[PDB]
Design a protein around this ligand. Structure first.
Ligand SMILES: *[C@@H]1O[C@H](CO)[C@@H](O[C@@H]2O[C@H](CO)[C@@H](O[C@@H]3O[C@H](CO)[C@@H](O)[C@H](O)[C@@H]3O)[C@H](O)[C@H]2NC(C)=O)[C@H](O)[C@H]1NC(C)=O
Ligand SMILES: *[C@@H]1O[C@H](CO)[C@@H](O[C@@H]2O[C@H](CO)[C@@H](O[C@@H]3O[C@H](CO)[C@@H](O)[C@H](O)[C@@H]3O)[C@H](O)[C@H]2NC(C)=O)[C@H](O)[C@H]1NC(C)=O
Ligand SMILES: *[C@@H]1O[C@H](CO)[C@@H](O[C@@H]2O[C@H](CO)[C@@H](O)[C@H](O)[C@H]2NC(C)=O)[C@H](O)[C@H]1NC(C)=O
Ligand SMILES: *[C@@H]1O[C@H](CO)[C@@H](O[C@@H]2O[C@H](CO)[C@@H](O)[C@H](O)[C@H]2NC(C)=O)[C@H](O)[C@H]1NC(C)=O
Ligand SMILES: *[C@@H]1O[C@H](CO)[C@@H](O[C@@H]2O[C@H](CO)[C@@H](O)[C@H](O)[C@H]2NC(C)=O)[C@H](O)[C@H]1NC(C)=O
Ligand SMILES: *[C@@H]1O[C@H](CO)[C@@H](O[C@@H]2O[C@H](CO)[C@@H](O)[C@H](O)[C@H]2NC(C)=O)[C@H](O)[C@H]1NC(C)=O
Ligand SMILES: *[C@@H]1O[C@H](CO)[C@@H](O[C@@H]2O[C@H](CO)[C@@H](O)[C@H](O)[C@H]2NC(C)=O)[C@H](O)[C@H]1NC(C)=O
Ligand SMILES: *[C@@H]1O[C@H](CO)[C@@H](O[C@@H]2O[C@H](CO)[C@@H](O)[C@H](O)[C@H]2NC(C)=O)[C@H](O)[C@H]1NC(C)=O
Ligand SMILES: *[C@@H]1O[C@H](CO)[C@@H](O[C@@H]2O[C@H](CO)[C@@H](O)[C@H](O)[C@H]2NC(C)=O)[C@H](O)[C@H]1NC(C)=O
Ligand SMILES: *[C@@H]1O[C@H](CO)[C@@H](O[C@@H]2O[C@H](CO)[C@@H](O)[C@H](O)[C@H]2NC(C)=O)[C@H](O)[C@H]1NC(C)=O
Ligand SMILES: *[C@@H]1O[C@H](CO)[C@@H](O[C@@H]2O[C@H](CO)[C@@H](O)[C@H](O)[C@H]2NC(C)=O)[C@H](O)[C@H]1NC(C)=O
Ligand SMILES: *[C@@H]1O[C@H](CO)[C@@H](O[C@@H]2O[C@H](CO)[C@@H](O)[C@H](O)[C@H]2NC(C)=O)[C@H](O)[C@H]1NC(C)=O
Ligand SMILES: *[C@@H]1O[C@H](CO)[C@@H](O[C@@H]2O[C@H](CO)[C@@H](O)[C@H](O)[C@H]2NC(C)=O)[C@H](O)[C@H]1NC(C)=O
Ligand SMILES: *[C@@H]1O[C@H](CO)[C@@H](O[C@@H]2O[C@H](CO)[C@@H](O)[C@H](O)[C@H]2NC(C)=O)[C@H](O)[C@H]1NC(C)=O
Ligand SMILES: *[C@@H]1O[C@H](CO)[C@@H](O[C@@H]2O[C@H](CO)[C@@H](O)[C@H](O)[C@H]2NC(C)=O)[C@H](O)[C@H]1NC(C)=O
Ligand SMILES: *[C@@H]1O[C@H](CO)[C@@H](O[C@@H]2O[C@H](CO)[C@@H](O)[C@H](O)[C@H]2NC(C)=O)[C@H](O)[C@H]1NC(C)=O
Ligand SMILES: *[C@@H]1O[C@H](CO)[C@@H](O[C@@H]2O[C@H](CO)[C@@H](O)[C@H](O)[C@H]2NC(C)=O)[C@H](O)[C@H]1NC(C)=O
Ligand SMILES: CC(=O)N[C@@H]1[C@@H](O)[C@H](O)[C@@H](CO)O[C@H]1O
Ligand SMILES: *[C@@H]1O[C@H](CO)[C@@H](O)[C@H](O)[C@H]1NC(C)=O
Ligand SMILES: *[C@@H]1O[C@H](CO)[C@@H](O)[C@H](O)[C@H]1NC(C)=O
Ligand SMILES: *[C@@H]1O[C@H](CO)[C@@H](O)[C@H](O)[C@H]1NC(C)=O
Lengths: 387, 109, 109, 387, 109, 387
């Protein structure tokens, strides 16, 4: 018999594509399907990084620039004094302000000649809030529910989700804080573990709690430039002068480090491995805690084959993501600062392994490893006996 | 009720009963303007391509395009009871535009 | 000629003859961008939802789905001669999704 | 006896929703329907308020700042002389300028230490144009037609319109000008009359005409203070120096106050009421007349248990809608300025009653009190005897 | 065969078989958000202006409105075998809105 | 017998349009159709001019302004010195720079008195690239393929194209550079030959090669005024100095003028045609060669009834379209630069004939004379026998 062409609308097939995901702040299982995933070719990570750059640029656009503070400072933390113009242009008034050591260079501010300093707007905050990346109509976001997932490879338990979970945009350099933990084992994923250039991402099945503090009791002082331009800075400290530190329980870190070493030995050949030490922005552990930007020295943790106290520095002028042509002055926070977080992931780089990485893109690649964006193609053709 | 794309692993005979589950969710209204405009255009392009061939608003319709064995020589029970739509699309990805223009030619002729 | 939306207070036995003047106004082509995209999306959503059910080209259509008494058990004289469309929308409001799902399933046969 | 499902299109039902009403610059009567209204929870007021602020911020964006003003003004209305830089950077010229008294704080401009002063472009015009708010396809606007509607509660007679009437964006603090008169009587309406903090909106049925004038013959002069940057100031006055005043007929105002008292005593208990007097933006009557922002002392209108002359002052630096950082230098206008207006409504605040009009959203609640936006839902299902 | 808009010089009888190549390319696929929304709105305006009259799913439709000789009165073979579409659009340009209103009125019954 | 009206969709007819085309960086013959064209009321010229002005203004937005250069200069091409501030705002220092004669007036800069000088950003370049204009969906672009087309009138060979040919947005005043050559013969076209006001566009069938060079060996120097605001200028010249000039073959230009005079004698009456010489912006040949804006004296070419050498000057500060208060500082290039270009067109003005081309829309009328945009109207009605 002859066979004739039919057309079907609503065919359940998909093809790979890139779309314009939007932020937002159901799940069905897909049986008998073996869609393959790849964590190192995701467009969602690039789109998330571009959106974070676009959001950080837009918040610092309208408010005050710190051009008139590129003056000579008579510094004696440090106590410094300078000449500055008051709101009347003809009059010049002497003032004073405390500065941290990393903000000043022999004094003057550290980022005068490099780029222009735009002060952060005095009411904004850097508290991370969860962001769900969601796909428009006609697209779908797949998820791989395999427990032993390694990144590049085919999945056996694929599911279509409405959109992603609560990805918190936490900024960190070496230890990934407040992330999502693995289900069964400590999992190490790399694009090529036999290459020295490629970074190594570790995910911990059990978190390590970290406590950090700034015991100096600062107070906030305001300095006026002219019409409608102000500047907030520390005036004095009411109390004893102390350093800022972070505490990690040593037994938890030792057990976690033993598990990392065991699984990393299992991935590599049967050889001994040692953990070694790592510009303060790429060497030290950089994160924000309560509004202040800490820079903590992590050479005590990675020194292997009660508590551990890590000394830290506070920095107010930051120029992260290496954008030449922009800088940022975070306003100081009055009172004591205390915060706690869970260590979830560590970024390693090649016997000898050391924490390394100035890219902030690998922080979000450890959250978006389960997901993939597809495009629905509902039209289909098939032969039927008679039409 | 298997939900949206729930019958993607089911056979072509079984997945043909869930066309309205997928077809209801191609259109929005469930910064952001690009996504909504893109969804509207993808649905509208598919609807225009369906309406050019004829019979957009009803099920039973005559097409009168003969099937070529060079496209697929597989028996019909093997098509409709053994495989899914994904490998069928993989088999007939390159031949699809010929089928589309033959359906368009049979519309006016 | 009652005009647009003027049969809202009438009973649904008499309001059902006036559906043309409500249908003819909901059109396109006659903060601008948000309003235009919203109007396009609402028109396309109504047309797609009407076209999946069958009867895309007419205002009064009726399917093979049997009415369940659990949704509403009152008689036709109570429905069509005692109540307006607002009250009837208030009765079966939580059962609209089940009825729409049953209509979409029955049209696929 | 079997009932089968029938699908109707064009069903006349609606639900409450908030939409994006677009500006533009027909009524049908709905019978046997009762719809409740609430003008304090109306969303058209917030939409109009945000649109007017966005229009003002769009107008003040490219029209250049006033820095380097705020130099030390030496003043003898006032005659002030100051040193300013010329178009060449390293040279200083001497200029003189006539400024009003309220623009000057002890000299120095009034908005120097609070906000950046963006000068207003000389093309600009503050004349109100009527704006009709229209609803898109699928939405509708319901109008309440009760002649004694008190703002809340159900409305017996409801009608539907495509767009609102000619709402004029008149900015005025204490006395509403060029508004919509009531149908029958003076109507006093409030959210609840027992709370003293809630504002009281009075709407008159007979308008009271006001005549305001600026009898000084000012001349305008351009001062250039930079490369391609210049601004306009009053050069000199020709003729006798006179004050700006507004004239109100005393018989009309006495009858208006007696009607307001007569209708207001019907709400409160049996108690005599007295009108008492009320930072010039909130204390005295501030309004625009011919391009100059008059500030008129209204203690004679509200002092009770031929013509009434109210003295007025002129300001050129205003910072409307209470937002810090957005002041505007209004350019002066040469020649005598005269305007006439119709007094439509008075804003009151608690017996003793004094005018308080600090917010600008109560100017637009007196116009958008009839209207309400709804979302039409054309689909519907019902049982019949088909098939 | 003649490509997009290639039968503009031919007669109506020759160009009536090739309406698809002008009908297909009215969608996109070849700030720019506004022009893109404008293209979608123009296509939807033409589509629902067609859909008010009936025959939403076809390119050639036939209506019940009788032809009036006041609009044009020349012979049918001259119209359908000798004249281009543009010359006919020039002739009845004063009466297109009236014919559209009569077609809209007849479909209302 | 009896006829009924029928509706057709996809009808090949079109009407006039004024839509906004989109940039980009298929053809159908259309037998048996005639369309009228008009290059003087063509709307693509205004669209191209608005787009070019918008991109040229957008490219000059983010980077540095030269307000601090507006200071007196103690000059000895001139060697000038000035005083600016350092990167530190407190102290000042003395620098020197080499400026051309056309950029200074008796010494201050050319446009500090009226305009705002903005430096062209060092990342961007002035090299033109081909630009294709494509009609949006629902519209079409018609092209007239007639070889004898005189600018307005009916066209016999009309064809439809998706996008226009590659048009380079070159900058020229008197001689059209790198344009589209005529098909077979030198063609003159104008709006009204008897009108003195209307310009004259001349197109050539064979091009004339022009070679221009800058023999000085300039060296780039960097100058800073503060945080992140740099400035580039010539530091010194290595070797002997020599003026810039352009070379043109004399016999080829003489034959070109003979053919031009023949066609001007054909269009006008049979009489004596004489060419005469033509503010450096409109008198001299203003064009770009290798990144520096040349200004060449052209009185040798247009004086008639081996090579020829035209002296040229160099401007660093230009103002395209003579915008009110906005100009541009082009940063100088280091070392010698040479360039070569085709001469394909001359703009003339009326017998005596003098070249003047100060408007840049007549530059682009020579490239978009073949094109026209139309709007497709796919609906149509026609009587048919069948009901
Ligand atoms: C993080 O903390 C560690 C430990 O506090 C820092 O390591 C310390 O680095 C300094 C300078 O590199 C070492 O000083 C050196 O001492 C040797 C004698 O041992 C002397 O010969 C050298 O001339 C120099 O003075 C110091 O010994 C070393 N601490 C330890 C325990 O070895 C590290 O620098 C910190 N990280 C950063 C980024 O600053
Ligand atoms: C972070 O970890 C460090 C070290 O584990 C903690 O430092 C410890 O703090 C306690 C209480 O402040 C100290 O105890 C005190 O010792 C003194 C003698 O020095 C004694 O006179 C007091 O009565 C009291 O017992 C303890 O000595 C100190 N340990 C070290 C090695 O210095 C620190 O408190 C932790 N911080 C947080 C926020 O958890
Ligand atoms: C495959 O993934 C699914 C994920 O849905 C697993 O099924 C359960 O799904 C429910 C749905 O909400 C979850 O709440 C459960 O946590 C899932 N797991 C269990 C154990 O119930 C399913 O188990 C996975 N199968 C395999 C073989 O990994
Ligand atoms: C990881 O990268 C290394 C890079 O050295 C790859 O090793 C080489 O791959 C090339 C390409 O086929 C071979 O010709 C070489 O013989 C390989 N070895 C060496 C020592 O150069 C390696 O294949 C990569 N691994 C994965 C899984 O991609
Ligand atoms: C940190 O410093 C602040 C600023 O002096 C302290 O706050 C003061 O505390 C005293 C004692 O209770 C009060 O009398 C003052 O009124 C407080 N000042 C303000 C501005 O509130 C604070 O107590 C200090 N904290 C510690 C732990 O030393
Ligand atoms: C970080 O600080 C928290 C308190 O904010 C610590 O939690 C306390 O831990 C002690 C000792 O384990 C317990 O006795 C308390 O009951 C805990 N209190 C709370 C509120 O949890 C936590 O231990 C600190 N982390 C580290 C590593 O020391
Ligand atoms: C996924 O594949 C499995 C394996 O074939 C399906 O399970 C059985 O499929 C056969 C083939 O039709 C049926 O005869 C059996 O009745 C199925 N088992 C059960 C328990 O029903 C399974 O149905 C497939 N899943 C989907 C969604 O199609
Ligand atoms: C405006 O007037 C209406 C009546 O037209 C008031 O509504 C009444 O409110 C009282 C107090 O809650 C109720 O007991 C009545 O049943 C209401 N009547 C109706 C018809 O709903 C309304 O309260 C008035 N608004 C104000 C602010 O006073
Ligand atoms: C505004 O009202 C005042 C009344 O206070 C008017 O002033 C009077 O004008 C008449 C006519 O010129 C004089 O005879 C009176 O002597 C004035 N009264 C006083 C107290 O001076 C004034 O003319 C009115 N102005 C306008 C424009 O109507
Ligand atoms: C407010 O009203 C009172 C009473 O009407 C005014 O007081 C009168 O002022 C006049 C003018 O000086 C005197 O001749 C009367 O004797 C006063 N009467 C009383 C009872 O005091 C008062 O002047 C008014 N205030 C203003 C600003 O107009
Ligand atoms: C511009 O610079 C020149 C130097 O290049 C200045 O000329 C010197 O002036 C001083 C004081 O008048 C004399 O002692 C030197 O002998 C001059 N040198 C030369 C080479 O002439 C000149 O004065 C400067 N111009 C101004 C206005 O200051
Ligand atoms: C009318 O114009 C068309 C182009 O729009 C000309 O067609 C071209 O003819 C040349 C020479 O025969 C061919 O090399 C090209 O390939 C043709 N173009 C296309 C798109 O086919 C045509 O010759 C012109 N006719 C006249 C009489 O001038
Ligand atoms: C071209 O220019 C000529 C003059 O140079 C125009 O001719 C004049 O047109 C005006 C307006 O119609 C008449 O009042 C004059 O009498 C005309 N003068 C002559 C000498 O004819 C002519 O209209 C312009 N346009 C065209 C298309 O030729
Ligand atoms: C272009 O070159 C000619 C060369 O002759 C210049 O004309 C001379 O200009 C100077 C200065 O004004 C006069 O003294 C001569 O008498 C002129 N000679 C002639 C023959 O006219 C002309 O000025 C130059 N043009 C420009 C813009 O540089
Ligand atoms: C314009 O052209 C005329 C004609 O060639 C030039 O006049 C000649 O100039 C040369 C140079 O001095 C003399 O030797 C000839 O005798 C002149 N001939 C005549 C007829 O006068 C004139 O110099 C040219 N002008 C410019 C500015 O280039
Ligand atoms: C441009 O034209 C000039 C002539 O105006 C050429 O200059 C000649 O160059 C040759 C070789 O260098 C010399 O022998 C001649 O004496 C020069 N003539 C004159 C009048 O000076 C020059 O070569 C041409 N080309 C370039 C690239 O400049
Ligand atoms: C105009 O000048 C250009 C170079 O500036 C000439 O273009 C080159 O000419 C040679 C010789 O025919 C070709 O081999 C090259 O392919 C051409 N380059 C390009 C990019 O097309 C051109 O010949 C000159 N003349 C005309 C009439 O354009
Ligand atoms: C008596 C009076 O004030 N008349 C004015 C009138 O002169 C003006 O043209 C118009 C424009 O707003 O406003 C009113
Ligand atoms: C089927 O396709 C082949 C090429 O794929 C072609 O040669 C053959 O003619 C086609 N069959 C028919 C009946 O046209
Ligand atoms: C009516 O609805 C109830 C509850 O949803 C269900 O149990 C019953 O089977 C339904 N009846 C029919 C005839 O579908
Ligand atoms: C035909 O058109 C003319 C136009 O004047 C009109 O008067 C006449 O009634 C029309 N005839 C019919 C049958 O509609």
């Amino acid at each position: 018999e002859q066979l004739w062409v039919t057309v079907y609308y609503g065919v359940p097939v998909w093809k790979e594509a890139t779309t314009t995901l939007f932020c937002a702040s159901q799940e069905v299982v897909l049986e008998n399907v073996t869609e393959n995933f790849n964590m190192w070719k995701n467009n969602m990570v690039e789109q998330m990084h571009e959106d974070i750059i676009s959001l950080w640029d837009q918040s610092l656009k309208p408010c005050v620039k710190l051009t008139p503070l590129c003056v000579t400072l008579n510094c004696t933390i440090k106590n410094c004094s300078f000449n500055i113009t008051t709101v009347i242009k003809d009059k010049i008034q002497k003032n004073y302000a405390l500065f941290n050591r990393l903000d000043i260079v022999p004094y003057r501010l550290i980022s005068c000649n490099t780029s222009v300093i735009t002060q952060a707007c005095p009411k904004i905050s850097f508290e991370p809030i969860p962001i769900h990346y969601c796909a428009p109509a006609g697209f779908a976001i797949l998820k791989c529910n395999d427990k032993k997932f390694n990144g590049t490879g085919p999945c056996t338990n694929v599911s279509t989700v409405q959109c992603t979970h609560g990805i918190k945009p936490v900024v960190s350099t070496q230890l990934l804080l407040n992330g999502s933990l693995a289900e069964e084992e400590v999992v190490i994923r790399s694009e090529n573990f036999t290459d020295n250039v490629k970074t190594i991402i570790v995910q911990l099945n059990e978190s390590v709690i970290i406590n950090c503090t700034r015991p100096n009791n600062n107070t906030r002082k305001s300095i006026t430039f002219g019409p409608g331009r102000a500047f907030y800075t520390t005036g004095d400290i009411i109390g004893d002068i102390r350093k800022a530190y972070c505490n990690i329980s040593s037994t938890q870190w030792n057990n976690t480090l033993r598990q990392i070493a065991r699984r990393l030995r299992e991935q590599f050949k049967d050889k001994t491995i040692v953990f070694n030490s790592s510009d303060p922005e790429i060497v030290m552990h950089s994160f924000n805690c309560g509004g202040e930007f800490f820079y903590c020295n992590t050479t005590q943790l990675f020194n292997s084959t009660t508590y551990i106290t890590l000394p830290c520095r506070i920095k107010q002028i930051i120029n992260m993501w290496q954008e030449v042509g922009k800088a940022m002055y975070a306003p100081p926070i009055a009172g004591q600062i205390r915060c706690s977080s869970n260590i979830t992931g560590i970024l390693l780089t090649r016997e000898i392994f050391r924490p390394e990485g100035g890219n902030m893109r690998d922080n979000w690649r450890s959250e978006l490893y389960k997901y993939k964006v597809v495009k629905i193609e509902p039209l289909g053709v098939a032969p039927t006996k008679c039409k | 009720f298997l939900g949206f794309l729930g019958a993607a692993g089911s056979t072509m005979g079984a997945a043909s009963m869930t066309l309205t589950v997928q077809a209801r969710l191609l259109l929005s209204g469930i910064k952001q303007l690009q996504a909504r405009v893109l969804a509207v255009e993808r649905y509208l392009k598919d609807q225009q391509l369906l309406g050019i061939w004829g019979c957009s608003g009803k099920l039973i319709c005559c097409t009168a395009v003969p099937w070529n064995a060079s496209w697929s020589n597989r028996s019909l029970d093997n098509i409709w009871n053994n495989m899914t739509w994904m490998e069928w699309d993989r088999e007939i990805n390159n031949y699809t535009n010929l089928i589309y223009n033959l359906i368009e030619e049979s519309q006016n002729q």
